[PDB]
Amino acid sequence: LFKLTEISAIGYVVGLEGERIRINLHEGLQGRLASHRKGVSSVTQPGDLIGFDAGNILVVARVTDMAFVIPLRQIIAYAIGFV
Amino acid sequence: SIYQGGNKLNEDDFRSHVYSLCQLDNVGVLLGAGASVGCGGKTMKDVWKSFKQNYPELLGALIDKYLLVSQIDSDNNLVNVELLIDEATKFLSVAKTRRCEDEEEEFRKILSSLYKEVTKAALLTGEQFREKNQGKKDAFKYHKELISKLISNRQPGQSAPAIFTTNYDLALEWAAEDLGIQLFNGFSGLHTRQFYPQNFDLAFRNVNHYHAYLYKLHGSLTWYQNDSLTVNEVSASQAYDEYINDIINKDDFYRGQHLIYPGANKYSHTIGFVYGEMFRRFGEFISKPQTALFINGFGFGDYHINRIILGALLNPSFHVVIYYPELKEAITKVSKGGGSEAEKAIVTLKNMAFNQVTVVGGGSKAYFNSFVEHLPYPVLFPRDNIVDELVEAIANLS
Amino acid sequence: SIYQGGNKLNEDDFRSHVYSLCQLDNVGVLLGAGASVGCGGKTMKDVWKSFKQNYPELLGALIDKYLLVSQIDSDNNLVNVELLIDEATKFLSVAKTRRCEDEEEEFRKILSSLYKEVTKAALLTGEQFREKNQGKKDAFKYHKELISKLISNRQPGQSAPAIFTTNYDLALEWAAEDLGIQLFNGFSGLHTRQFYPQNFDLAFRNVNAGHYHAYLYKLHGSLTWYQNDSLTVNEVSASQAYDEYINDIINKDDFYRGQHLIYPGANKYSHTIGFVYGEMFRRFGEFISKPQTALFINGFGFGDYHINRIILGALLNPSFHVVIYYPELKEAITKVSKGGGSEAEKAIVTLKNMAFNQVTVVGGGSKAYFNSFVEHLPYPVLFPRDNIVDELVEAIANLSK
Amino acid sequence: SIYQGGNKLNEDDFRSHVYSLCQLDNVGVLLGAGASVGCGGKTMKDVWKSFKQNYPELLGALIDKYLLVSQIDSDNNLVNVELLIDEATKFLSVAKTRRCEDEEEEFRKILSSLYKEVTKAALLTGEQFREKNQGKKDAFKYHKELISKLISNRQPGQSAPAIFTTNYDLALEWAAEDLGIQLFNGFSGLHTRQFYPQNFDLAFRNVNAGHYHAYLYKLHGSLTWYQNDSLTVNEVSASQAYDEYINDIINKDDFYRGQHLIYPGANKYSHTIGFVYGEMFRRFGEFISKPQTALFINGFGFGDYHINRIILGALLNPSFHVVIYYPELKEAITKVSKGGGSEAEKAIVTLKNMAFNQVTVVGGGSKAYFNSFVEHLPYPVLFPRDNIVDELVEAIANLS
Amino acid sequence: SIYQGGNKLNEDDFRSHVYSLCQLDNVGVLLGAGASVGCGGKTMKDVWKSFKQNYPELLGALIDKYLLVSQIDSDNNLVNVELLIDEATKFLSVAKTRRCEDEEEEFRKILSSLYKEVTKAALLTGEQFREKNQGKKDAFKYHKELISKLISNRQPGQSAPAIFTTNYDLALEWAAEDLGIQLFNGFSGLHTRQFYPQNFDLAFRNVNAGHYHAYLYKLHGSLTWYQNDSLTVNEVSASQAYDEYINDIINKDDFYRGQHLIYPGANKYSHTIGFVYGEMFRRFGEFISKPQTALFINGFGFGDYHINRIILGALLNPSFHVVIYYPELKEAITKVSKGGGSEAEKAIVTLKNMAFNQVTVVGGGSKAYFNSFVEHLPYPVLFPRDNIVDELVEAIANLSK
Ligand SMILES: Nc1ncnc2c1ncn2[C@@H]1O[C@H](COP(=O)(O)OP(=O)(O)OC[C@H]2O[C@H](O)[C@H](O)[C@@H]2O)[C@@H](O)[C@H]1O
Ligand SMILES: Nc1ncnc2c1ncn2[C@@H]1O[C@H](COP(=O)(O)OP(=O)(O)OC[C@H]2O[C@H](O)[C@H](O)[C@@H]2O)[C@@H](O)[C@H]1O
Ligand SMILES: Nc1ncnc2c1ncn2[C@@H]1O[C@H](COP(=O)(O)OP(=O)(O)OC[C@H]2O[C@H](O)[C@H](O)[C@@H]2O)[C@@H](O)[C@H]1O
Ligand SMILES: Nc1ncnc2c1ncn2[C@@H]1O[C@H](COP(=O)(O)OP(=O)(O)OC[C@H]2O[C@H](O)[C@H](O)[C@@H]2O)[C@@H](O)[C@H]1O
């Protein structure tokens, strides 16, 4: 019953090289969009912003690429700070 | 007259929310009895407002003798017609069991007169109910667009739409047999058609956009139970000949454990098994991540569906949209100590700090034929009739 | 008598079939009320004799004045209880509306006495129900062998076992609190215990670079469960219960209220408030719908309409296997050949007369009981001796003779 | 008054140190008896006062004949009450075998008086002790914050938190049961619950869709633990204990059973009961001797020799860090610098004066309390500081 | 006889289960005080006699006034010692605290006597304890075979073997110094030898490309260890110890004041200053809870709560095997059926009665001893025959005979 987060997830890290982050995705997700208490947000296109939860802070990143490896999708991002 | 998050909206910022909602993983629709009045149907007031008029000599027993309905409700025309039929069906079994010969023939008349006003109104046409190719007409023109838009707005890999309804009429099957679309409904076979509750887990594929799903929560006119113990589906022509041309044009009700509408014989362990498996699927679709639900035609006079919806806002990925064309009067009435449970229920959530909810009013601006036009066509979809000029040239070749 | 595919099969092939069935990914066991006769349990044919002996004045009204049971069926003790508990509530619901205050009392008096007799038939040990260490006795060893074997014959990587039951008793818990094995049942906490349906997705793990467990699903409730109608289900031990809401039910001669939640009737959907009933049957199907799945059934009389529809619909998948034990099969085979027979015999012989080799039925009277079903299961071999080297030298032994 | 290595600090150098300290591999907490005063508890000297008010006749046979306590300490209220019951149990056990009937009654009658006075002070809710949902009441509001903050900031591949405590009350359990968290305390079962020490090495894991769990070590015992037969120790629920034994204790007089209770560190001479106390200190050392470790203390008076020994020995490892809370630095510095004070003051002072950047002490009276310790701990970002839950549950329950 | 899984098995399968068992990646042994009878040692039953045969007067007080022992037990020699010590240590504190000077002096002699009779029984050679090359005699032979076999059965990459022991004698070191093999016991140095617990993580290696070493864990200490502070423990040689303190104790009538470091009591946590005990049992735990593990137990009478409570919690891991020797296995299945029996035999009959194949128990009198135990372990095969032709050739020959 513990409410550790009021937000759904989008994927999980699988790789770290230099300052470019590599992400894999979940299964049902196709159409660029995610939902939450305030509404709907686009998450997949280049030029968009994405966030990682790291303990007591939040790391912010910007998307660069999008590719295949129902096949397997993959994303690349670059960090620009933290909240 | 469009309230999101407790405060107001405008047409464009809402027509841009709709489009983003239809692109989620799971999409569904819930319809009611007010959606079929543009095709030959009738709401649930007009049914009692006519039973009252045509049969007054029975309206006294129900109130003064057996206590099945109340006076103020009957005068204000606010009675539920499904629970009355269920209770009157359960009063007859006891008498049939313990051999009371007066209370057994007193209820056959009541039930014959009740099963005769809802049938006559669920026939959207009349004596053309037994004929063929009825979805080709003009009344069934927006039902088609609904399905077309719900199917053509998906992507490859994304699931297929779902449809729930409370009617017991044949307006979405006629209108799909014409487009060329296939609906799953649980039944299989032609010469002996039977209910298998796992056919909801199947889908097509080619080996060289075909299907959808339909859930009927209160039954249909073509479902019945035989001298065996199994439910069977048949076609309209066959039903008209067996058990529908006698109901109206005669006085016959002796098969009291035979029909499966509108939610009557739920004390038999074989007929309730088919009602349960629909709510058990509603309450399982409405509990998934990234879900959207559009409601229309439904008056919130049911306790369980409300207790089921209210408990799904606790997940932050479920969104609702509601159409209610009498919202002003309800706010008025509950402003000063009044109103019924439906109005209180809708006003309760009209005032909330929840961006998941959105309410729409305005009379003719919240009707079915406007709900439809708020939905988008794709830009690469064929619309111009460019094949019809050519099917008559093949007929001129007599 | 053993029939696979409608044909005839023998014992030294049955025993080699079971071995290979017990090496599949998903394995399961569904039990009933006959699996608890070797521990002090009764059956529905005995509940009726007890209710006949005691309370002889209500039976009168029940036969004569209300036309609700027949004299023959009574005498021969063939009556059903779940289809009577499901009419004594209709007859009430009608009177609660007609306002017949006297008719509204006999049926309470009857339902109380019908619920009081299926309650003191799940107390396997009568008055020592509240004491401790009841799994150390001799009546609970064939319940330990089952769990030991089911857990033993698993490999590293393959999922854990599930156990489905319809009873109310506590045998499979008394018989695991002894071994020291931990079963998952969906509850959590000690001072305030609560049902959350996400504890069915947990496992164990050692915290380095006691990992035995299993899952238990009761489909009809328990004696240690109760509801305050706040839409929360609370679990309790077996002494608090006896102290607070069971001794009353048995001895105080009161009326009945929803003290504890059990579903003994015939239509479990009429209970429009039960939502824990619906998270178990949502897992039964999710289990049998997987590939590489085997099920063993024992103790079940096949009188449940909502259960004997799922097994039929799971048999259209080529990776599901089922084994069934039914002692009195010849009588059914004859009674249906004579155009008669009940709805459970018509189902078991229809399962026996198939043409697929994924169905197996096992009759033979005492040869189909719970103590033989367990000896039929194998112990594993840990260091697999190929003995291909041994073949060379043990082959020559026969030559000398 | 904040000191690191003798030198002083400011709040903003301190709050920027706590955060750096809470990001380490292993984290821990060690509480005491004062932490439970904001809920309905008491302190060890407020216990002795009430003892010697109501029972002043048995207070002579305890200082004159048997030599069990001293007058200076009895007057200044500096008695250990968990170290006297053990000795009295020893005396009684010896007298049973030596068969001196003139001496068993005079010990039963003065143990029944000590247990009656230590029990009454640990219920925290009086007669509302056997009821349910006692973690919703507002008295238990910061015990939840502590747990939630300790959990909500850990990353994948990092050990879970441990909580050691000297109390023998049920507050942390009452709180976790209402948050929906699981605590491991060494027991397993519901109809017979037994002690298994091999399951402080276990953890949870999810199959397809988890890390909401923590470890709890209680160093002196609990009111829900007892012993029935020679070889085993059992745990029960509050409603069950209250009905079995905890009631006669309060109401009835001259009621004493024997070697049946496991609180506080009393029957430490058997071999089935000390096995339970020793494992805890074992695991305490095994934890406090890892690399990259941090420890916060609050509520502890430093009246124990072994714990101080363990801590001082542990401080040889350069990767161990500590934080302490003592709101009497000023009232002790002088009392110890003039002629001398008491061993607790001397010990706590020896640490203030060192060349260590990995020690820290805090004072200020009401500024070094529990309701303020719980507030120096960082609060996460995504954790919601808003409650749109109750407004929905209210409507769900109003529906009718 | 020989039991497995609660059932019975034969000699020719045990002889091969052992073989298949010694090829795993973790193998260990646990010895007691019986394994040292073939060399000059004694048991606890042979200590009560030597106490009552040389200290007859004190015994009178123990039986008459303080009432600690029964005449029946003394006459029948069924009296424990590790429980008498813990009571003689309890009668003393409550006399020192209430200032009775006539009981301190009467309880300070009994403990000295019990500590002298426990010391004279761990030398194994009497006056020749201080000489050199004592691992050359004919007694310490199977102690050499055991180590040789344990070490020669390891393939590269695998880890070294472990040994666990209670007794204080030096029979495992005398037999490895005479053999050229270096055991590890925690300490390091020669002129000042001192305990560092991170010496259990070291390992030899070679320059270019010996491999013969093992670890020794003593759980109750030795009689070559002494303490001088709270942070240090020191070790000396045998000749050195026999001059310093082990001679006075034996001959002079002094009170033992903590010269050497042994735990012969029943509750070993009352010693609130010992920090070696914990580091030993921690490694015992860490070893018993990893996969692919085998353990042999010999000499142990099953009278230690702390170890019988660890062996039970490790049988919930399905990769851990034990083998247990116990001669008097029949006189314990006899007594425990008719109610009677001490805890020692209860604990092991509980193990005999199980349903897991990961437990084996051996009995049979004088064929469960140490010399028989050693001869059941296998020598390795240096050049492993593929042996296809070996058996092929004899297979054909049989008939012509
Ligand atoms: N042309 C139209 N288009 C859209 N909506 C309309 C139209 N005309 C009327 N309405 C609206 O349609 C609504 C008509 O409400 P009712 O037919 O009484 O309720 P139900 O159809 O759920 O009845 C079935 C229930 O009966 C049992 O109680 C079960 O619980 C079933 O759920 C009004 O609000 C109108 O504003
Ligand atoms: N020692 C034994 N071992 C194994 N089986 C036995 C034994 N003795 C009798 N049997 C068999 O045990 C069977 C008992 O059949 P019944 O008691 O009518 O069925 P139920 O107990 O499931 O009925 C209760 C449920 O029925 C509804 O579906 C509800 O779900 C109820 O929960 C017989 O076939 C015996 O041959
Ligand atoms: N609200 C408060 N917040 C924080 N600290 C407080 C508060 N109120 C008082 N204090 C402090 O709480 C302290 C109370 O100290 P005591 O309860 O006597 O000590 P113990 O509970 O460890 O006693 C058990 C030990 O005694 C044996 O030696 C055993 O070995 C046990 O380990 C004072 O210093 C107050 O400043
Ligand atoms: N030649 C032999 N070979 C093997 N075993 C033998 C032989 N002779 C006798 N035995 C067996 O040796 C057994 C008697 O061994 P015990 O006197 O209990 O030695 P202990 O060290 O356990 O005793 C002190 C314990 O106290 C503390 O708690 C520690 O845990 C200690 O273990 C019998 O079963 C004989 O069959």
CSV table of N, CA, C and O in Angstrom, one decimal, chain E residues 39 124 133-137 139-148 151 170-183 370:
chain,number,residue,atom,x,y,z
E,39,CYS,N,43.6,-42.2,20.4
E,39,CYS,CA,44.9,-41.6,20.6
E,39,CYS,C,45.2,-41.3,22.1
E,39,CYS,O,46.4,-41.0,22.3
E,124,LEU,N,46.7,-36.2,25.8
E,124,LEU,CA,46.8,-37.4,25.0
E,124,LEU,C,48.1,-38.1,25.2
E,124,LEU,O,48.2,-39.3,24.7
E,133,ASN,N,58.1,-33.9,17.8
E,133,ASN,CA,57.8,-35.0,16.8
E,133,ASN,C,56.9,-36.1,17.5
E,133,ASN,O,57.3,-37.2,17.6
E,134,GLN,N,55.7,-35.6,17.9
E,134,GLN,CA,54.7,-36.5,18.4
E,134,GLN,C,53.7,-37.0,17.4
E,134,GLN,O,52.9,-37.8,17.7
E,135,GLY,N,53.8,-36.5,16.1
E,135,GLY,CA,53.0,-36.9,15.0
E,135,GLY,C,53.7,-38.0,14.2
E,135,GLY,O,53.5,-38.1,13.0
E,136,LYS,N,54.6,-38.8,14.8
E,136,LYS,CA,55.3,-39.9,14.2
E,136,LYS,C,54.9,-41.2,14.8
E,136,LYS,O,55.1,-42.2,14.1
E,137,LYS,N,54.2,-41.2,15.9
E,137,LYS,CA,53.8,-42.5,16.6
E,137,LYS,C,52.7,-43.2,15.7
E,137,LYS,O,52.2,-42.6,14.7
E,139,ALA,N,49.7,-43.9,16.5
E,139,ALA,CA,48.3,-43.5,16.9
E,139,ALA,C,47.7,-42.4,15.9
E,139,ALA,O,46.5,-42.5,15.6
E,140,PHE,N,48.5,-41.5,15.5
E,140,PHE,CA,48.1,-40.4,14.6
E,140,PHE,C,48.2,-40.7,13.2
E,140,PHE,O,48.7,-39.9,12.4
E,141,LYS,N,47.6,-41.9,12.8
E,141,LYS,CA,47.7,-42.4,11.4
E,141,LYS,C,46.5,-42.1,10.5
E,141,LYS,O,46.6,-41.6,9.4
E,142,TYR,N,45.3,-42.4,11.1
E,142,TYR,CA,44.1,-42.1,10.3
E,142,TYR,C,43.8,-40.7,10.2
E,142,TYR,O,43.2,-40.2,9.3
E,143,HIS,N,44.3,-39.9,11.2
E,143,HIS,CA,44.3,-38.4,11.1
E,143,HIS,C,45.1,-37.9,9.9
E,143,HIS,O,44.9,-36.9,9.4
E,144,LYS,N,46.2,-38.7,9.5
E,144,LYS,CA,46.9,-38.4,8.3
E,144,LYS,C,46.2,-38.8,7.0
E,144,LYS,O,46.1,-38.0,6.1
E,145,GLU,N,45.6,-40.0,7.1
E,145,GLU,CA,44.9,-40.5,5.9
E,145,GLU,C,43.7,-39.6,5.6
E,145,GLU,O,43.4,-39.3,4.4
E,146,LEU,N,43.0,-39.1,6.6
E,146,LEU,CA,41.9,-38.2,6.4
E,146,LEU,C,42.3,-36.9,5.6
E,146,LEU,O,41.7,-36.6,4.6
E,147,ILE,N,43.3,-36.3,6.1
E,147,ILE,CA,43.8,-35.0,5.4
E,147,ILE,C,44.2,-35.3,4.0
E,147,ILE,O,43.9,-34.6,3.0
E,148,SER,N,45.1,-36.4,3.8
E,148,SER,CA,45.6,-36.7,2.5
E,148,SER,C,44.4,-36.9,1.5
E,148,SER,O,44.4,-36.4,0.4
E,151,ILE,N,42.5,-33.7,0.6
E,151,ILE,CA,43.2,-32.8,-0.2
E,151,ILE,C,43.4,-33.3,-1.6
E,151,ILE,O,43.4,-32.5,-2.6
E,170,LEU,N,45.4,-31.3,20.3
E,170,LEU,CA,46.2,-30.8,19.2
E,170,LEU,C,46.5,-32.0,18.2
E,170,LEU,O,47.6,-32.0,17.6
E,171,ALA,N,45.6,-32.9,18.0
E,171,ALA,CA,45.8,-34.1,17.2
E,171,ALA,C,45.7,-33.8,15.7
E,171,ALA,O,46.2,-34.6,14.9
E,172,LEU,N,45.2,-32.6,15.3
E,172,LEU,CA,45.1,-32.3,13.9
E,172,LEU,C,46.4,-31.6,13.4
E,172,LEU,O,46.6,-31.6,12.2
E,173,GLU,N,47.1,-30.9,14.3
E,173,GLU,CA,48.3,-30.1,13.9
E,173,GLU,C,49.6,-31.0,14.0
E,173,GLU,O,50.5,-30.9,13.1
E,174,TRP,N,49.7,-31.8,15.0
E,174,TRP,CA,50.8,-32.8,15.1
E,174,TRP,C,50.8,-33.7,13.9
E,174,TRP,O,51.9,-34.1,13.5
E,175,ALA,N,49.7,-34.0,13.2
E,175,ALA,CA,49.6,-34.9,12.1
E,175,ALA,C,49.8,-34.2,10.7
E,175,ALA,O,49.9,-34.8,9.7
E,176,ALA,N,49.8,-32.8,10.7
E,176,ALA,CA,50.0,-32.1,9.5
E,176,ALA,C,51.4,-31.5,9.5
E,176,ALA,O,52.0,-31.2,8.4
E,177,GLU,N,52.1,-31.3,10.7
E,177,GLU,CA,53.5,-30.9,10.7
E,177,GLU,C,54.4,-32.0,10.3
E,177,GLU,O,55.4,-31.8,9.6
E,178,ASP,N,54.0,-33.3,10.7
E,178,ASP,CA,54.7,-34.5,10.2
E,178,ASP,C,54.5,-34.8,8.8
E,178,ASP,O,55.1,-35.7,8.3
E,179,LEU,N,53.7,-34.0,8.1
E,179,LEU,CA,53.3,-34.3,6.7
E,179,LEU,C,53.6,-33.3,5.7
E,179,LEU,O,53.5,-33.5,4.5
E,180,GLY,N,54.0,-32.1,6.1
E,180,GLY,CA,54.4,-31.0,5.2
E,180,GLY,C,53.4,-30.0,4.8
E,180,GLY,O,53.6,-29.3,3.8
E,181,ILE,N,52.2,-30.0,5.5
E,181,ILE,CA,51.1,-29.2,5.0
E,181,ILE,C,50.8,-28.1,6.1
E,181,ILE,O,50.9,-28.4,7.3
E,182,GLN,N,50.5,-26.9,5.6
E,182,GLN,CA,50.3,-25.8,6.4
E,182,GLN,C,48.8,-25.5,6.6
E,182,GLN,O,48.1,-25.2,5.7
E,183,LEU,N,48.3,-25.7,7.9
E,183,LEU,CA,47.0,-25.3,8.2
E,183,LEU,C,46.9,-23.8,8.6
E,183,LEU,O,47.9,-23.2,9.0
E,370,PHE,N,35.5,-44.0,13.9
E,370,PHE,CA,36.3,-43.1,13.0
E,370,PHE,C,37.2,-43.9,12.1
E,370,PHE,O,37.3,-43.5,10.9
